[PDB]
């Protein structure tokens, strides 16, 4: 599952720059009022460097 993807970090994952999915993850990850924290982890997989 995407949860089981987001828990581990030994295989990295990402997406195409400026895509709708990219900005959607950026939006999800920064929002502290979000119910499901998973995106706030995945963003730190995608935002690296």
Partner 1 sequence: IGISALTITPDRENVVDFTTRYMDYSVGVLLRRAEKTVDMFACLAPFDL
Partner 2 sequence: EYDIRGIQEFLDKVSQQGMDVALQKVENNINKMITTLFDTMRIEELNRYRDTLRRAILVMNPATAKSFITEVVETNLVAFDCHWIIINEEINDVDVQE
Name the site residues for partner 2 (rule: CB under 8 A): 23, 26-27, 30-35
Q: How far is the CB of 36 from partner 2 (least distance, A)?
A: 11
What contacts 30, CB < 8 A, 6 or more positions away? 40, 43
Considering beta carbons, is residue 16 or 20 the nearer one to partner 1?
A: 20
Shortest CB 28 distance to partner 1, Å: 11
Among 9, 21, 37, 44, binds partner 1 (CB under 8 A): 21
Calpha distance 44→47 (Å, rounded): 5
Q: What whole-number distance in Å separates Cα of residue 38 and Cα of residue 44?
A: 10
């Amino acid at each position: 599952s995407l949860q089981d993807l987001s828990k581990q970090t030994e295989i990295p994952y990402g997406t195409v720059l400026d895509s709708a999915v990219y900005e959607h993850v950026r939006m999800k990850g920064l929002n502290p009022f979000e119910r499901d924290s998973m995106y706030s982890q995945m963003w730190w997989m995608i935002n690296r460097s």
